[PDB]
Structures are given as C-alpha cells and as structure tokens.
Design a protein around this ligand. Structure first.
Ligand SMILES: *[C@@H]1O[C@H](CO)[C@@H](O[C@@H]2O[C@H](CO)[C@@H](O)[C@H](O)[C@H]2NC(C)=O)[C@H](O)[C@H]1NC(C)=O
Ligand code: CUO
Ligand code: CUO
Lengths: 106, 131, 106
C-alpha cells in the first residue's frame, strides 16, 4: 500500500523526497513526465467524442467522473513513484477551515 | 458599464447634465496623483476667458530645462503616450487659427461671447448645455 | 452560481424581496468541454435560511440565480435553467384528506 498522507502532517524528509522527485518528474519530456501526464487532462485536447470535433479527454458531469479521476490519480501517483516519491500523493482536507493555501505550495 | 462587461461604452459623461460633475471629479483624480507625486500646487489652468495670442509654454515647448539642476529633458506636458496601441505611439496636435482671434471694432472673440452666453443662464441644465 | 431567496409581493411594484442570499455553488467547464447534462437535479439545501426568514418551508417563495462567469463577467440569467424549490415533508406525513361525499351532483 502506497500511503497518501495529509499534506499538513508531512515530515520535512517526506517533503524533501516529494520535492526532488517531482522536480525529476518535471524534467522528463518522456510519457512518464509531468507535462505528458497533465496533457491527459484538459488542453491540448487529443480526444474526440460524439460529434466529430476535438474534445477534452477528461470526463465531467457523467457518472464516469469519479472513476476517471481515480485512475488519473493512480497514473499520476505512479508517474511520481517512477521517481521516488517514497510516498503517494497527499490529500489536503479543505473541509477543514483555512487561512491560506497549504504551506507546501504557499 | 462595469469592468467585466462583454460590450462596453466610453466611460465619461458627455452631452448630459452631469457632464460638469463627472469631469470635476475626473480632474481631482488626476490632481491627487501628481500632488502625491510631488507637485506643490494643484492642477494649473489656461483660461480662454482672455483672448489667446499663443499656446502656453509648458504646453508647447517640446524640451524642458530644469533651472536648478541645469539638465535638459523632454517636456512631459508636450504629449502623452498611448500604452496599449504601442510604446511608440504619442498624442499629436493641430492648432486652428480660430483659437487666436482678437477683438475687432465692435466684434468680440467667439469664446468671450459664448462663455458669457453660458454664464448668463439661470437654469443649471440651460447652463450645462451652453457650457 | 449565487442563490437568492425571493419572497413575492402581490403588486405591480416588482418589489420581490430577493435581498437575502440562500446559497452558492460552482461549475467547472471550458471551451472544448465534453457536452454534458446531469441525469438528476442538483439539490442545494436552503432550509436554514428559509426558517431564518420566519416563513414556513412549505409556504410560497422562490429561488433565483446570479451567474457570474469565471471571467468576472456577469451573465444573463437565461444561461442556466431556472432553479426551483424542492420541499420534503416530515415522514411520515399525510397531506389533508379529501372533502366528503357529493352534495349531491358531480
Ligand atoms: C468571459 O465571458 C464569456 C466566456 O465565458 C465571453 O462571452 C461569450 O460567452 C458565450 C457563452 O457564455 C459565447 O457564446 C460567446 O461566444 C463568448 N464571446 C466571446 C467574445 O468570448 C466573454 O467574451 C468573456 N468576457 C470578456 C473578457 O470579454
Ligand atoms: O479535474 Cu477534471 O477534475 Cu477537478
Ligand atoms: O471631454 Cu471628456 O470632456 Cu473635455
């Protein structure tokens, strides 16, 4: 089990492996890289559906939405771990009241 | 209309009763900027009430020399830049001789007669339209 | 999408008390978005504000929507189908019985 922790509860070492890992992922032009994975969702649209023009690949508004983003999160998680990334991508609980964006991205 | 509108019109009021009010507040807008930008005085005027012989110096001379620091520089009041069109786009001017008319025998300069004509009005809206 | 809670006035006055805002929600989208429509109505609980106004939830009022684009550009109300108020009675609930037998002709 790759563990997805709370963003708030991360240890500086966890943060460090995350940092160097996602930097390494950022320097990949390969399909394992950050850009290639991000392009799966949104612009540019490689998908085509129903009426034959170019359409965004991600699935929204349909019952297939949660599964799609579930798999997308796996794909990104593994795209991370291909560079350690000893841990899985953290979630931030915004059901909790906030003052600022989580410190990692502040 | 608001800064977010799809279709927009020109902002300032013209051809309506509140024209003087809008442009009064518009001048104090410009005034407070340059007072905080280090002007010791308010916004100067050039009154057309007097007959004109010439366009004012700080308006007309392209270059200005600081008497105190002796450095010749471009006169900021000569023209203005229009930012969005291009960095190299300036306001330009053409002067009609109708500006420099002087009183004749019985005759009086266009502005004089017409300024009084406005000032004669007792009703604000009648004043505004002439004004 | 901003949810305004309106109370009718019986007049030509156009004075509909829509002063009080009942709710708020958000919608993601874009150009080259995959065309979509929910198979079920999205419901936004507005009961609390309705009770706060001192009027029964069963009684008459309506709900209107201020739709601002992400542009900041305020949009026509027609962009979204008009909201409705859904009322859910306390189970178990029998609404008022039918008035009695014919006197005498139907
Ligand atoms: C931002 O608001 C909309 C985009 O959300 C723009 O206006 C139009 O949006 C409708 C759909 O709601 C389209 O049918 C039009 O083709 C859009 N027109 C244009 C010119 O984009 C609007 O342009 C945007 N506001 C600004 C900044 O102009
Ligand atoms: O991104 Cu497609 O889901 Cu929030
Ligand atoms: O134009 Cu806006 O007023 Cu001289």
């Amino acid at each position: 089990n790759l563990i997805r922790k709370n963003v708030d509860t991360l240890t500086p070492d966890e943060i460090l492996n995350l940092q160097v890992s996602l930097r390494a992922m950022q320097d990949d032009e390969g399909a394992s890289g950050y850009q290639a994975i991000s392009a799966y969702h949104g612009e540019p649209a490689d998908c085509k559906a129903a009426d034959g023009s170019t359409i965004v690949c991600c699935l929204h508004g349909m019952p297939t939405f949660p599964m799609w983003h579930r798999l997308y999160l796996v794909q990104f998680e593994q795209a991370l771990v291909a560079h350690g990334s000893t841990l899985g991508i953290p979630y931030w609980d915004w059901t909790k009241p906030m003052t600022q964006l989580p410190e990692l991205v502040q | 209309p608001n800064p977010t509108a799809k279709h927009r019109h020109a902002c300032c009021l013209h051809g309506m009763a509140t024209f003087p009010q809008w442009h009064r507040l518009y001048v104090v807008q410009f005034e407070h900027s340059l007072n905080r930008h280090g002007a010791i005085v308010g916004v100067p005027y050039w009154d057309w009430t007097y007959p004109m012989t010439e366009v004012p110096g700080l308006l007309t001379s392209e270059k200005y020399t600081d008497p105190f620091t002796g450095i010749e520089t471009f006169n900021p009041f000569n023209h203005g830049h229009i930012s969005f069109i291009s960095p190299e786009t300036m306001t330009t001017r053409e002067v009609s001789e109708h500006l420099f008319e002087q009183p004749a025998l019985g005759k009086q300069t266009w502005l004089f007669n017409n300024i009084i004509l406005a000032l004669e009005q007792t009703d604000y809206c009648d004043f505004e339209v002439q004004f | 999408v901003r949810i305004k809670l309106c109370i009718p006035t019986e007049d030509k006055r156009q004075s509909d008390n829509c002063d009080n805002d009942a709710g708020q929600f958000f919608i993601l989208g874009g150009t080259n978005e995959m065309p979509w429509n929910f198979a079920f109505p999205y419901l936004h609980e507005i009961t609390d504000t309705v009770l706060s106004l001192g009027l029964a939830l069963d009684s008459n009022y309506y709900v209107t929507a201020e739709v601002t684009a992400i542009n900041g550009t305020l949009m026509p109300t027609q962009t979204i189908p008009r909201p409705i108020v859904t009322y859910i009675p306390p189970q178990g609930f029998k609404d008022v019985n039918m008035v009695n037998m014919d006197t005498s002709s139907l």
